[PDB]
Design a protein around this ligand. Structure first.
Ligand code: HEC
Length: 83
């Protein structure tokens, strides 16, 4: 995985909700404390259009167009930066 590529994608597309340090602002889930496998699995679920939690509709649009490479890069960044 490419941590730098994941960082750039996170900063552009994810940070507004999940935070610069992954803590999730006031109401969005934190992405701290989770490894790359976990993040990969979750992003793949959202991308596939699975119902995850009660607020799937807020998150799913942000996963729908991710490639597998994107997912791997994001997951590597999140693990390195926030775990
Ligand atoms: C705010 C509008 C969001 C943006 C932008 C992104 N995410 Fe998100 N995410 C958001 C919510 C409300 C939720 C919960 C949805 C639900 O199932 O009820 C999530 C969830 C995640 C998760 C799962 C967290 C966990 O299970 O521990 C991950 C890993 C996650 N989101 C990652 C993520 C990334 C990488 C994003 C940019 C591509 C992204 N999110 C955008 C809200 C928002």
């Amino acid at each position: 995985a490419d941590i730098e590529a994941g960082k750039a994608k996170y900063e552009s597309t994810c940070l507004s909700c999940h935070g610069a340090e992954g803590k999730g602002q006031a109401i969005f889930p934190a992405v701290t404390g989770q490894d790359a496998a976990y993040v990969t699995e979750k992003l793949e679920q959202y991308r596939a259009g699975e119902q995850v939690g009660q607020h799937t509709a807020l998150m799913a649009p942000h996963a729908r167009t991710l490639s597998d490479e994107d997912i791997a890069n994001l997951a590597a960044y999140i693990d390195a930066e926030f775990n």
